[PDB]
Design a protein around this ligand. Structure first.
Ligand SMILES: *Cc1c(COP(=O)(O)O)cnc(C)c1O
Ligand SMILES: *Cc1c(COP(=O)(O)O)cnc(C)c1O
Ligand SMILES: *Cc1c(COP(=O)(O)O)cnc(C)c1O
Ligand SMILES: *Cc1c(COP(=O)(O)O)cnc(C)c1O
Lengths: 425, 425, 425, 425
């Protein structure tokens, strides 16, 4: 009945390993609104971490889910197939950028998708190594933790994660890492630790999520594409977070001018239901022999119809266009707040994948994690749910549903504005 | 909308890597019945691979899920908590064997569950290695494929999986591997490849699933518990398939006389919805640092209320007792069929985790995979969905819902009988 | 100038990790005789661990070393070549078993030899994995420690050695490991952990050295050759200790009835000078890209002429024949002693690679390591230098120079006799 | 004989993997001169690759070797000890930089030295990972190949070498890598791939050998020392090539104003005889349990006395001072040449570890591997033996024995002078 009472029960029944950003227990929600067990209402700007681009319980999505719930919820596709799985795969084959034929594998979590994307690139190229970028995030399975460019706290006390994962530098001028540096950092790997003939794939987020909402430029992605082409290396675009419309296009790669060989997706693809997948070159996808791709819950029937409905909703409700409008509105509002607060050293973002980075006295060398965390706390006190990110915990991101109403856009910014103001005195 | 038609589309849009045991597209289901897209009815003895111990769309479970769909489907627990996740953890801490304080983490798939249990075991012991058994199955992520005692097809063509996973022999007298050999193979690892101080844990299925439905004796499990104790090794019981009441007790470990340090669960735990978790000795669970455990969909709201309801159903409908009664009825009918078919060299199983193993001319060293495959095919033509298993593909298992009707017990056995009779012709 | 003071100095200058079997400092030696700094004389039955098959400072060898010492000692072959290196390779190409063209590489230590043989096999098959046997010993580099079937003390406290090295069972009837068991253990790796297409080679000692002087039968070696042939796996014969004529033939494989794809050699090859090498099927040896192989001291000029002279000595002095007779005289006297002491549960060996194993009350399950240690200690008190081995340290081995004098043979046996009598007294 | 005839036999008996810089077969050598089988005389400016700082067959060294050759050549220190080994360890413990107690392990090759240094660091810190630098060279065993910052052609076709080796950038202002970049690259590893608590050691060459004769500054070495101190990481200085006086001090670290925890040495330590070793902080060296450190040839008797004699010679003949004088003469000579040849973009070196780097049209971005190779070829025709190096094969190094006469210094410079003039014609 009370948040604290539940937090106490949480401390006795659940390990501390599982962090709790907001010590609040949600009871119900709708679109951009969430009510806790105490009846307090909050404006959701986190969206279950980019999972709710269509909002909490989108009515069209729920109706689809209820219909399937009347038919069946599980059989395990590998044993007995079913249409929602097949249908979504065909739709994904069409929506993911690429003029060649694609095939889609459905799993359940983003971690699984990345895991499987890599397995596939290995079977296709008959190579074992992979390259990932600094500040990257790909999941919490041993292998994805190795791909993830961040050790603490995910691996603390555990020891070293799986080898044969090499680290390249993600391009980021704001912090002195040029596109030439990033590209140079890959050749360095080829020259020092693993030749091209041993690299199955280069995994990259078109727009890093946990890494701080940093976007790759089309130019860079084009260089990366040519580099992979030259070495028979599979380009894996991890769009688990950037995908499903966040950047203004269904997939961020559509704005890069090049197509990846494989793409992983999840989170917002099903608008609040467990589903993930991999879509890529048909022949690369088919490199794995029959029986080598599976998963009990893979492509859960309910989640499949949810995803299918999410995609219809994007089309009928013009969410991509709104995503872009929202991003502009958000960026204009934040640049306005920025004028009165030098700590805001950057307002960026493609589509609605918006973020601001805080710096101690505008020094691009002094990340202000203290201010960042304070703003998140004050925002919560004012009924607004926020999340931070970045390898230094000084980036504030906005992952509010694309279905957000205009008045709620102003409300959220006004609250953010008040937080910075009150953080002065 | 015919099976053949849908299969053609399958080959065009989905990777062949995703095997298809039965070329049938299920449309709807109810308890033990499943109807395909052509309207044909089937008796389900596979159960979505031990995922439906409470049957397809159990009314109580479905009603709980429908109620929760009016509240919320996702927030990501680590950001905004919710009570169903918490409640399930409290209940699992009590239900999982072990007379000491315990804590639970919820994830989404069995693979993730095994992944996390190992991460936890590693953090608690400050060690990196792990020992798994021959014929074991633990998932399809890079690391769990290594734990999995089977390379083909699971990880074929992909190159070698993560090292620092050693292989022990699972006790199996039917095939000349005594418990002494099994215990001896663990010491062999200790002396030849990895000292006890480098082994965080020994992962074992109380009853092997894909491995052939081979059960560990209480005596053996007890020697294993003593061995882990002497060396400070965590005993991880993988109960993703043996759990959720399939053996007559909620968890097979209850029948072993000893408690593991960690236990993984999934599949039947939520009767048709994506959920999994890890329950273990509180001090071991707490070893991971704050923020080190987490996944986007982990402990999904809908899945949780579903799991809670499954637990209530087991109680209200006496499913554990029924599991045992069902198992005895099954083995007896199978033994009656064996009187007329030597090829059946063994009938076995705890509770309702039943299987029979085929041999050419009853020669216990001549796995009869051709016949096994023939029985599955014949069964399908008679409307019965079955699954085989075992390293040599000569084991037929029964994972029909525990909520099976008396008549369906007669029907499935009768069909099987006809299959052997019509094959012997 | 006393052994005691030198040992004290040793404790302050040299790491304890370097063990000292005998706390004696040798000053000079001749053939089978050794004198310590205190002028005491000993009979060497250890031969610097199978390094002095031609005895300490064989005059013909020394004369050759002296002649080369006037010319040059080092240029580094890969930079500026020299004849002794080339000539030795040519001779080894002829001497190593295998009725087909071969090429040879010279390195410096047995460890490097195994390292290179594996590198060569990997380039030749395009595979990364290897299989080695229980109780095997292949060197103390990271990789050769992974290949070695013994963790402590070789790796104690160091953590886990390089992965992708799988363990098979060495055939050993005396301890219940049948040949069928050995072969079956290889297929187990193929099924549970690494498919044949990922195994570049199987490394095996025709006769295990540190492992207990257990020899492989021709029948077994033949099955192994067949198995490797079927899968295109390189068979690597590690003859660093079994080679250089210790078994009656120059290389133990000659007595197996089949040829390995690669053979490693060191120790006795150069009668007490630092040299090692790898000899193998020409096509296989050529797989490595030009400039991929190298080592600074590799094929040291002085060690080469010593090796070339050692081979001449073997032919001119019929050491292969004397090896067999020495072996026979040793076994006879050891069997003689065995009749009075049941502890000696087995006398075995090919050529002069002779050993006896000790058990508590002839109980093949109670390895008498304590008695073994006592015998070594007692023999030392009597002026005889011996060495033990075997995973349980209950194996006494004789590695006395093949050039030993008949009276010394009797002398040696008498001492061993006296040791057993006085121990059991 | 004929060089070419010997080369033909070489191509038939030895694998192409063993490259041949100079297609010449040496017969005799002395100090700085080498005579091939055709009787042709050459001035040696490569020194067997920095193995002959005291020149070919230094008379004092040969005499000691002959004296030991009359006593014994091998017993294997672990079985029976001998004074030469002990004496060398005692002397290295005091000469190797480090104001604290040290212990020394003697092995045989530089590769083995690095292998053991890492093994020791791992046992001492109880961690498994290591960090190495770009362009580094540490040996050709699997593990040292992983430490080595160059894949082709060492690893070609073999697949990926051992994991858990992370790449840092070596400071090299000439090519755009600042010391800040170098240190930053280490923190990048701590943040992205391996936490400090998992890093047992950071391996570095005070002056990179094969990497291009690029030296670390005291300032940088001091920052590195401070970083290691802060995390309890062992700083291993691989002075196999930089050691034994090449830089003007016995070890290059002396000039860094800071001491390493472990130092590996080989090459010139024994002036042309197979010997290598590890000298480091005593408690660290002793972290390995007895029996854990070994090697058959380790600390070969003859090589030990040669090494002890080399040490006396440096003192008696003032080679350290001569190394600095020689370097100054070479650099002055080379600078004069560079006044007429723009392709020479840099003249550098500590003591007598001298090198010049070649660029096309004097552009640091355009390495001239072709000119470099031409100079080597022309130099040889003129009777001068040279070696090149660097990741882009455009670096000419000088490793002539420190015992060279002024006339020969002038002669070598003149020969090099002509090559450039004649290469531009
Ligand atoms: C969220 C995330 C994941 C991991 O997905 P899960 O559904 O939590 O297993 C993978 N990749 C990226 C880019 C992510 O943001
Ligand atoms: C089914 C299974 C798994 C993996 O579960 P998924 O939900 O398919 O990822 C793990 N271990 C065992 C024992 C299983 O049978
Ligand atoms: C002695 C031995 C080695 C290691 O040789 P070293 O010269 O000490 O490196 C390798 N293999 C076997 C079979 C050995 O007995
Ligand atoms: C030469 C070298 C080595 C390898 O030593 P070897 O005697 O060839 O095995 C190791 N480290 C460095 C710095 C070297 O240049």
């Amino acid at each position: 009945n009370s948040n604290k009472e539940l937090m106490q029960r949480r401390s006795q029944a659940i390990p501390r390993g599982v962090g709790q950003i907001h010590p609040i227990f949600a009871d119900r929600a709708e679109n951009c609104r969430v009510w806790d067990v105490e009846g307090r209402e909050y404006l959701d700007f986190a969206g279950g971490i980019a999972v709710l681009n269509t909002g909490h319980l989108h009515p069209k999505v729920v109706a689809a889910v209820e219909a399937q719930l009347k038919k069946l919820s599980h059989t395990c596709f590998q044993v007995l197939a079913y249409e929602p799985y097949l249908e979504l795969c065909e739709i994904m084959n069409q929506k993911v950028p690429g003029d060649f034929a694609k095939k889609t594998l459905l799993v359940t979590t983003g971690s699984e998708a990345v895991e499987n994307a890599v397995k596939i690139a290995r079977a296709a190229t008959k190579r074992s190594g992979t390259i990932a970028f600094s500040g990257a995030y790909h999941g919490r399975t041993h292998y994805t933790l190795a791909l993830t460019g961040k050790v603490n706290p995910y691996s603390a006390g555990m020891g070293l994660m799986p080898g044969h994962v090499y680290r390249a530098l993600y391009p980021c001028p704001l912090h002195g890492i040029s596109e030439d540096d990033a590209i140079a950092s890959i050749h360095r790997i080829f020259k020092n630790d693993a030749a091209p003939e041993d690299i199955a794939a280069i995994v990259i987020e078109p727009v890093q999520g946990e890494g701080g909402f940093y976007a790759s430029s089309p130019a860079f992605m084009q260089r990366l594409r040519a580099l992979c082409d030259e070495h028979g290396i599979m380009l894996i675009a991890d769009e688990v977070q950037s995908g499903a419309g966040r950047t203004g296009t269904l997939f961020a790669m559509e704005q890069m001018g090049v197509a990846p060989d494989l793409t992983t997706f999840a989170k917002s693809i099903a608008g609040g239901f467990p589903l993930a997948g991999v879509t890529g070159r048909a022949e690369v996808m088919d490199a794995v022999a029959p029986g080598g791709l599976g998963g009990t819950y893979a492509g859960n029937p309910i989640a499949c119809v949810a995803a299918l409905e999410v995609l219809k909703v994007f089309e009928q409700e013009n969410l991509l266009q709104k995503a872009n409008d929202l991003g502009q509105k958000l960026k204009d509002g934040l640049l306005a707040i920025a004028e009165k607060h030098p700590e805001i050293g950057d307002v960026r973002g493609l589509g609605a994948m918006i973020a601001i980075e805080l710096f101690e006295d505008g020094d691009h060398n002094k990340p202000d994690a203290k201010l960042t965390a304070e703003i998140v706390a004050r925002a919560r006190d004012k009924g607004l749910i926020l999340l931070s990110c970045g390898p230094y915990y000084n980036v504030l991101r906005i992952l509010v549903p694309l279905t957000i109403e205009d008045a709620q856009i102003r409300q959220g910014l006004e609250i953010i504005s008040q937080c910075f103001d009150e953080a002065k005195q």
